[PDB]
Each structure stands twice: as C-alpha cells, then as structure tokens.
Amino acid sequence: KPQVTILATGGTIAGSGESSVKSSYSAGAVTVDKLLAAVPAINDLATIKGEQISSIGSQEMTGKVWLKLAKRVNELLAQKETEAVIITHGTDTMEETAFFLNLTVKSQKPVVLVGAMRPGSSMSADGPMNLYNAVNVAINKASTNKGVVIVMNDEIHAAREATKLNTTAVNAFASPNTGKIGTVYYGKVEYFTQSVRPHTLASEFDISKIEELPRVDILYAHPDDTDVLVNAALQAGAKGIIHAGMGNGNPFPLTQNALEKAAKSGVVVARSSRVGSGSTTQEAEVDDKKLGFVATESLNPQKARVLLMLALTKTSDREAIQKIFSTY
Amino acid sequence: KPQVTILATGGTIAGSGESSVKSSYSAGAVTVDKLLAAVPAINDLATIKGEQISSIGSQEMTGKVWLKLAKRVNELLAQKETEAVIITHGTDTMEETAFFLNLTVKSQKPVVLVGAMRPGSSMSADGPMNLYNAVNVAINKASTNKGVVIVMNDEIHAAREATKLNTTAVNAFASPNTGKIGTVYYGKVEYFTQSVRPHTLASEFDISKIEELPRVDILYAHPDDTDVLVNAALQAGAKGIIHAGMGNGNPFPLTQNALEKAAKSGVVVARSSRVGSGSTTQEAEVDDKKLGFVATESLNPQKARVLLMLALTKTSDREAIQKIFSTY
Amino acid sequence: KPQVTILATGGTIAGSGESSVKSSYSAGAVTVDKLLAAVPAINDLATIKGEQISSIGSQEMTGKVWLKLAKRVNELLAQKETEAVIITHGTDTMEETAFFLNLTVKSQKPVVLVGAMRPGSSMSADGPMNLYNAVNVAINKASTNKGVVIVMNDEIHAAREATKLNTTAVNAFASPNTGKIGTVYYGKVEYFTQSVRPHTLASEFDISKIEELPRVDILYAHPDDTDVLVNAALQAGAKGIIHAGMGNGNPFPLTQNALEKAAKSGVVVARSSRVGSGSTTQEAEVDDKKLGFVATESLNPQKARVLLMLALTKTSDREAIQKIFSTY
Amino acid sequence: KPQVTILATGGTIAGSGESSVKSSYSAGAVTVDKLLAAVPAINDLATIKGEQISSIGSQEMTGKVWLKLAKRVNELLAQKETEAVIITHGTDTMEETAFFLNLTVKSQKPVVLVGAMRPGSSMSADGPMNLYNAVNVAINKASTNKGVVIVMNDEIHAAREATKLNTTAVNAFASPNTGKIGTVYYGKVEYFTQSVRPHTLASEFDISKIEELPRVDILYAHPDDTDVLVNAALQAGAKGIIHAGMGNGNPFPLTQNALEKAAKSGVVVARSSRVGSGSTTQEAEVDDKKLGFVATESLNPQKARVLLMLALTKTSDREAIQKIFSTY
Ligand SMILES: N[C@@H](CCC(=O)O)C(=O)O
Ligand SMILES: N[C@@H](CCC(=O)O)C(=O)O
Ligand SMILES: N[C@@H](CCC(=O)O)C(=O)O
Ligand SMILES: N[C@@H](CCC(=O)O)C(=O)O
C-alpha cells in the first residue's frame, strides 16, 4: 500500500468528540489518529503517518508557518518511501498556502490540501468526504506532476488558479479563470486538464535557507481613496505592495501618486484587482513602465502577494518581477 | 414620446471621433449629442435631454460627485415631465454609484446606469447596444419601482446585488448572490424577479442637506496581517472601517486587536469579506457584540462602504448600524 | 409551534438503517418517522405530520402522481391548522414537480421541495442539513406568497427558475436565468428577491377535476436530424411537442417540416432549446406565426413540457398558449 | 508572415453590405474577402487564403459536410506552407463540428473555430473582435498541439469541453466541466491549461475513406416517458442512441425496457444527461453491464453523439465503446 503523510495545521476537519476506543496504531499525531477513526476507509487505501505542523485557524497563518511547512514537505517527498503529502488546513487561507507550496516544493510527487467548510460536528459535515477524496487524489498515478492541488467538493483545483469564492458554501472553492483540472467522486479520480504554467520542480524559487519572508501589504481601492495606507505600509518596512485596484487594476489619483513615490523609493508596487476574476493587464489605462509598477495579470491580490513575496527574496527589479508574474 | 434625461459622468460610451454633420438639436450636453449621433435609434424611443454632471473616469469618483449626482437625479425625477434618468458611467465603480443612488433617490421612476467594457472606438464596442437597451429599460412600464438598475450585456441587475466581477470581459457584471432581475434583448425588456430589500422611496436616508460624506476606509485581510493600516485610517479621521476579511469575514489577530481599539474609540468597524460572494454572517467565529463590530451580511466590501457611509450620516451606534445592514 | 406536513414521494433522504428505539410518536408515515429520528432538531421547530404519497425514484414520476400530490397539497393547505407542506423528492425530476405545483397549488402558504444528492447512508450526506433548512424555510413568515420553492445546498430557488444543472454535485441545483431568491444557512432564512411571474393562488390552472394530463413529448435537436421522432410522437397521440432546439430554438430543416405538419394537424409545437439557459425568443430565425409554433421563452424543455401540459387541459390555440408562455 | 486558410461554412460573421471598393486581392472565396474588408487588421498578422466549404446555417449541418470539412482541413495542414486553419461557423452547432474535428484532424497545427452571436450588421456585433482574436490564436506558437479550439468572447475553449450554454448572450460559450484553457484579449494570447484527454494526432479515428457516418439519434428523458421514440430510431436504422437522461443519466422504466431491447439488437445505447454539466457515471443507479449500455461520462448529449458516431465506424462492442468514452 502507498505511504502518505498527513500534515495538520489545525484541528480535525472530520469527526467530533473523543474516540470510542483507544487505537493500537499511533500515526504520529493525535489529530491524524482522530481523522483515521472518523474516516476509516482511508486506512484501506494507504499507510498513513501524521504530523502536527501548527495548531491554528488559517486566518492566523504566518510566513513562519509557510516556511516550516514547505521545508517539511520537501524533506518528506525526498524520502523514497513517501508517495504523497496531504495537508489539512482551514479554508480561509488555503489558497495562499497552496500557492506558496506550488512555487517552493521541489518534487513532482502529489501535494494535496484539503479542509471543510462545515465543522466536523455539524450535520452534513463535508470533511469526511473531502478527506477521503483527498487521499484518493494523493495516491493516484495521474496526480504526479500536476502541481499542488486543492481537493474540495468532489473537485481538484490547481493551486495557481484556486480561490475561496464564497463565505459559507460547501462549494466555495473555484478556479474562476480556468476551472477545476479534475474531479474526484467517491474516490474515483479523473483529470481533464493540467496547468501549463511552471510549478513545483520547475519553479526557480528556493526557500530552504530563508527564515523570514519579505513584508508585502495589500491595499483595497475605492472611490475617494487615500494615500495614508500606502504611507503606513512604507513606514512599516513594506518591501512590496499589492494594490487591489478598481476594474482592470486602476487606482484613484491620490493613491496612484503615493504608489509612484513608493516605487521610486524601491518598494515594488504590483497592480491586481478587487473584482475577483480576469487578468490585471499590461498596456491598458495605467502606464506601468512610466510609473514603475508591475501588472499581476491572471492572479488575485492574495496570491499575487505570495508571488511578490517570493520574488522579493531575490530581486526588486521591476522588469524581472514583471517577467515572474508573466511566467508563473 | 417619453422624456428621459441622460446624465453623463465622463466621455461617450458609444461612437468615436467627430460628428459627420452639426446636429440642429442640442440635447443639452455635447457628450449626449454624440451618443444620439452614434445610436440614432434611441431618438425614436424617447425625447432625450442631456447633462454633463462630471467629466471623469469612474476610478476618480468621489463622494462630492455622488452627492451632486443624487441631488440632480432627485430634482429631475420630481418633475412631472421627466419619466426616467439614465446615467452613463465608467464600469469600474458603477456598482458603488448605483448602490448610493439606490438608497438616496426618493422616487419610483426608473434610474438606469450604463457603461461599456470596450471603448466606443473599439472593434465590437459594446456601448451602442448597452445604451440602446438602457433606454428601453428606462421607458418600460415594468421598470417602475424596481430600484436603481445597472443595464449591461443584455441583463438588468438590481443595484443592491450588482458588481463588476471581471477585469475585461463584456459580461463582467454579475449579481453573484441573486442573479439578474431581468433581461433586455435588442430592446425587449422582461423582468423575472425584483429585490425584496427596501430601496429608493422606501429608504430612510436623505442626502439633500449633506455636503460631505463620512470617511470610510477599506482594509484587505491576509495572513501575517498588520495593525498599521487600521491605525493610519484612525489617524486620518476615519468614521468607519470596512474590513475585507478572510473567508467568512475573519481577521488576523493583530488586526482584530487594532479594530477592537478602533471600535472602542467610536469608529464603526464593519466586517465584510475578500472572497467575492456570500454573506459575512453574524454569530460565526467572530464575537461581534463583545468586540464592538457590525456584520455586513450579503454585500461586498465596496458596497458595504457605501451603506456604512450613509449610516454614519445618522448614527454610529453599533446596534442601529447592524439593523441597517440587516435591512437594506 | 407551527404545524407542518411532510409528504414523502420515495424513501428517506436523511439517515440510514433501523431506528435505535421504537418512537412513541407516529407522524403518520414510517418514512417521516425515520426523518424525525435522523434529524431530531426539526421536532423543536414544528409539529410534524407525515404522509406517503408515492414510493418511487423521481425518474419514475408520472402525471398520475403529480395530480395526486397537487390535490393533496391543496387539501392540506386549506386546513386552518396546516401552516406549510414539505415534500421530500428525488432530485432528478424535482424541478418538474415543483413547477407543476407552482401552477396548481391554490394557496399562498409555503410549499417546499427538498432532496439529497448523496444517499442518507453516505459519508457527508447532504439530506440532514437540507431537510433541517427546508423546515426552517417552511415556517418562515417571509416564505408566504413566494410560490413553490426548492431548498437545497443552503439556497432557496423559485420553482419557475430552478433546475438540476449537474449530475452529481451537492450544489447541482441552480436558477440559471435569475439566481436563488434567498438563502438558508443553519436554519437562518433570508430572502433577497421574489418572482414577478404569477404563481400559485394567482395561476389560472385548476387540476382538481383532472384525472389524466395531456401527452407532451420532448425532442432533442442536432445536426443531421430526423422527422421520425416527430412522426412517432404524433402516432402515439401527442397533444403537444416540446422541441429542444439548437441554439435559440432552431430546428434542422427535415425536422422543421415534420413539426409544421404536426402543428397543422392540431398538435401544439413549442420551441425550447437544448443549450441550458436563456430565452427561446420570438421573432428570431424561426417564423413562429407562419409555421404555427409557440416560443417557450425563458424556461427549459422539461419545464416547458409541464406548462404546455397544463395549457392543453383547456386550449390548443397557438396564440392563447403563446400568451401563457409569455405570462408564467 | 504566417499563412493561414480561413474556411467558411456559411456567410460572413463580420461586416455587412457591399464592399466600398473592389479588392485587388482575391483570397479565394468571396466570404473571406468580405471578412478581410470588415476586419483589415488581420491582413497585417497573416497571409490569408479563403475557401467556401459550405453555405449553410449551423442548424442545417450534416455528417456529409463534417466529412468534407475534416478531409479538407487534413489536406491543408499537411501542406508545409499552411500554418493553421480557421473555420467560420454558426454558433448553434459549432461545438459538434469542433469536437468532430478534434478527433479526426491528424495534425498538431492549430485549428480554430469562430462565430458571432450577433449578426455582423448588428449594433455592437461581436464577429469582428472574435475573428481578429481567432487569427491571433491561430498563429500563436503556444497554440500548437492544444487540439481544436473555439475562440469566442476573448476566451479559448478546448473542443472537448466547449458548449453553447445560452440562447442569445455574446458570452454563451462555456466549458462547464473545466473552463477555458486560455484567453485572447485584443489579440494577446495566453494559455493557462491544456486538455490531458487525447486529441487530433493522438486520436485513433480516421475518416479519410468514410463517405457516410453511422446514424445516431438522441432522446430527451422526462417523467411519464415513452418507448415509441426508441422504437422509431430502431426502425429508421439507428446504429446508436444517446439517451439524455434525468439527473445522473437515469431513464424512465418504459424507456429503459426499450433501450435494453435496442442494445440487445446490436444498437449501441449510450447514457448521457439532460442536466448540462457533470459526468454521467458508471456504477451509479443503472447497471450498465447487465443492461448492455455505455456511460458517456463527462460529455453532453450532442458531443457524446459525435464520439459514438466515430466509435461506430470501428466497432459496436459495448466494452470497446465504454473504453473510448473513458479515454477521449
Ligand atoms: N475559518 C477557520 C475555520 C475552518 C474552515 O472554515 O476551514 C479556518 O480557516 O481555519
Ligand atoms: N476604467 C475607466 C474606463 C471605462 C470603463 O472601464 O468603463 C472607467 O471606469 O471609467
Ligand atoms: N435518482 C434518484 C435518487 C435520489 C436523488 O438523487 O435525489 C431520484 O431522483 O429519486
Ligand atoms: N443560428 C444560425 C445563425 C448564426 C449564429 O447563431 O451564429 C447558425 O448557427 O448558423
């Protein structure tokens, strides 16, 4: 049977309350033992080990955890015995963790993030099925070299494209620019597409010696906008700013002036959009070359932040970072 | 024939270049004369007058223009001869202006906002059809008391529900929580639903004596978030803050602490979400009553901002503002 | 506590296996007693009675059952004590039953259809939550006069607009032309819109003395299409034919000729579309007046069939039936 | 400059009326000359030749035209000088022609289908931009080996996945199971995914010596369904039947019995769904092995028809055809 490690970043996504008997197997983490008791069919698919990487809600995630998780995933996947890793994660920032891993995991072996929009105690909890399906995706031959994937609601989403698009629905995850790459229905895995943007083993980024990521703030644009938030990000040591602009990444004039000053000072300014989908394009209304900005193209603000953070580990050159956004 | 006024807030959304002859009719604004020359079929539907309210891209909109536009719309709709108003508007912030008007226009006569995702000079420009359709909606008997509507891409969207959800597509407008309320296809208007949330003549808000709206900032949440943007909004005199939270309106802890301090100081803190759709609900993970926050429910950050601005013209009381979010 | 009757048309949508003790309450139908044991929170919301109207999968539904169900719903809602009816139903044809009821139930009291995309025995079964939410919708004050609604996946869909749009997903139901009219999240009910098309108490249709509905067939259009299926429907006594046409309701020429002959013979031919959404419009490529056809407008083939069946209970006049499609 | 041939299957999708001067260039077909006059920017991108393959609306398409078009595309793409083919096509059945070509074109050179939801004479006609974008996609280096694509509304759709899902919208094309594979915005082409299902040069099908395709009918399921349409398809010599079932491909019992008889007689019965999206799966409620049916999985009825037609040129064996549906 294939060997898989489940890494938990918080509590159980499946089941609730104490175990009905004390297990003879220790997977390596109590959270994971609870998952194996709550979804026992997964034991027939794989030999499961468990680790607890963090113990937080995903809204409390930090770069320090991202680095710890990525370094551990790389170690695990370098082992001959380990076929895949599954990470259980809160849904709120799952997309940011998945995208970070998609650029930092140096392996073609599957890495699957999974969570639950309803708590395990709830009526009609989604976690048990989502986890069962995640294991099936992780052990599937066709999952190799698909990049980091999010598995939710019977769907397989590429990390580059995935986002949480709804506050509460079980079907909150979507890939608004491309769609799911595959499906998983009662464990039956089928892929229909794959990303043509480089990831994982093909990514230039390497975080193995990084202990802290560069600070990148995100700003929300609107009518009658301000310069004070740009100024405060500068004052706090921001190395980059994502601007979630109006429509196709457009700033309000006062804010544009402050961002221009930021970029002149050596802080990378990258234009995204508040709208939810589509590309924040080059050569539209904003003269990025003249102003010293980068266009994030077909991402969203929070994933653009992750990419800008990685880019800033090695360069602040506007052209090099535009090429990064135009590649990954 | 019905009398309609078109109010322009920027340039022409239809046609391009100089007129092929100097018209004998002056509608009242050069922009509108250019529209009538570009889309002549509209002259057979209505007697059109025109005014230029502002001359800006929608990303440069301000509360001063909103107040001027709302006051003029109210004057026009009080006239017995005026059956409807159409407003040509940039797409970027059309949703904000429409929502503002939906709560400040004291009339059941139709108010239609309309724009173009492609410039009038473009191949396959969408403005001409959008405008033609907008006129048809404005004069239709069934458009009375539907509230302010956005007419784009053959669809009629209720202002409360509409948003721009794509950076570049002609079909960028959506109503992600409810759908379009009607269709307009080569001028044929059909309504299938209407909003049950109060608007227009039923709204408590009145801006007739207001010269400046309350300052409301918006913040974009993410992992490893900060307190410095909250602090800078306070320092700049913010009367409210919309927090675009992670998932179902969740803040990062450092930011939550700053927002709690803000709320205690009498700055209203309203929780929305960065995700795109769904309600930012009460009684989920955030204890709003204990922390002193409002849950914006089924809006998005930029429209919640509008509603919080209007609320702040009347009150800063947490319970009263929650009731406003729970009503409108 | 409000009194509600649950009518079951098949098996349990929630729970699985035998009861853990023999209940002291008999709701009136074993299926319903099993539902109350599987979702016990519903007993705190309402006094529930149960009946078994049929015992079938929804793919085996027939007009005979539709008539039995509608007549019973009308009887129940005429009782002073009965506040609402919930019907548990298979998902496959739930939209057809809901639409039929929306035109035949002569009451403003709520009628809610609910089902489950996963069996009650499944991991992460959706039935328990869907039922819980259905009860909450049924007892909600704002549900009065909303027409027949489908409650699935935390959403409230108007019967006129609802369809099953996916083969397996828990979120398979949608209203592709208008969206959900409301939401229901852990029992909290909110409406955002309502239908402006007449239903229920305002419908002209009355089935109280009808024992069999008129035969209406549906045909699926494609390239290199045929006349033999039109001919066989005629031969079998079809009173009406829905043609699920290519694009905006377009037939292949051989098929068009056969439909023209059908319409001349007194069989009503109504044009819908195979595409999934939008209106099959009048005055597009097909000259409906000349050919003797009706345009179904903003429905789909299966719901158009239901409406044509009801129309044919009293008329086969082309113009009267076009007015029916243009009204309901 | 790259050489491209445009093949027209009907009239012009761009421009309208007579030319303002008689061109000195003849592209080879009057339709294509009219396109070059309507969209002159395409002449700077490629050397265009034109041919008129057929002169019909897409709702009049037949297998004879498909065979002529596929054979001509194969000849053209075998020429060293020809870099790509573009096919102008009515929207109604574009998806069927694209899917057919995706399995019969033996080349990795780009094949792009393109049409217009509005006539060229219309206000805000979409043909010009669609065609301009189609040319850009056809000449793009990254379009090699993507399979046959549909380019509409600034989107690139894989032929396997594309469908027309709305009757009238300019954005009617979608890929409901996977999404667009790329974008094309004012000619700027970007791919984000590709199909992992074999196509074109990797397809087993070869139609070079085929003069007539096997007859395949499609049936629309509903409650109170019949056996007479199955029987009439058998009588007319159907070699396969696509059943557009209720929900996850479910038949009504009377119809199931007729289909079982059909299958026993050696007519292939393939289960799809009327719903719109999702897989019609194996091992759900229908015992395909016992009844002698194929499950079409993640297609729709009209594309399943195409694939079943091509399958029937090689085999009628149930297992072999299931493998074909499970591969392509
Ligand atoms: N909001 C929490 C709860 C769990 C969930 O929704 O996934 C988180 O993101 O961790
Ligand atoms: N972004 C500008 C350009 C026009 C448009 O996008 O509609 C505006 O919103 O006014
Ligand atoms: N297909 C069956 C099973 C139950 C379900 O999917 O709702 C039905 O429609 O009754
Ligand atoms: N229905 C016709 C008209 C053109 C169009 O809809 O694209 C066809 O498909 O050819």
Author numbering:
A (entry chain A), B (entry chain B), C (entry chain A), D (entry chain B): 3 to 330
Paper text:
By administering enzyme drugs called L-asparaginases, which act to quickly deplete Asn in the blood, this drug specifically impacts ALL cells, starving them to death while leaving normal cells largely intact. WoA, like most bacterial Type II L-asparaginases, is a tetramer built by a dimer-of-dimer with 330 residues per protomer.
Surprisingly, we observed unambiguous electron density for an open conformation of the flexible loop in the other three structures, WoA-P121 + Glu, WoA-S121 + Asp and WoA-S121 + Glu. Likewise, both WoA variants soaked in a Glu solution had ligand bound but the open loop conformation. In this comparison, WoA-P121 + Asp represents the closed/active state of the enzyme (pink), whereas WoA-P121 + Glu represents the open/inactive state (green). As the catalytically-relevant state is the one where the N-terminal loop is closed, to better understand how WoA-P121 would accommodate Glu in its closed state, we modelled into the open WoA-P121 + Glu structure the closed loop conformation as observed in the WoA-P121 + Asp structure. This modelling reveals that whereas Asp fits without strain into the closed active site, binding of the larger ligand Glu (Glu has an extra methylene group relative to Asp) seems to be incompatible with loop closure due to several steric clashes. First, whilst the Asp Cβ atom adopts a conformation keeping it in a compatible distance (3.7 Å) from Tyr27, the Glu Cβ atom adopts the opposite conformation that would bring it a relatively short distance of ~3 Å to Tyr27. Second, the active conformation taken by Thr14 in the WoA-P121 + Asp closed structure is not compatible with neither the Cβ, Cγ nor Cδ atoms of Glu (modelled distances of ~1.4 to 1.9 Å). In contrast, the L-glutaminase rates at either saturated substrate concentration or at 0.5 mM – the physiological blood concentration of Gln – were ~8 fold higher in WoA-P121 compared to WoA-S121.
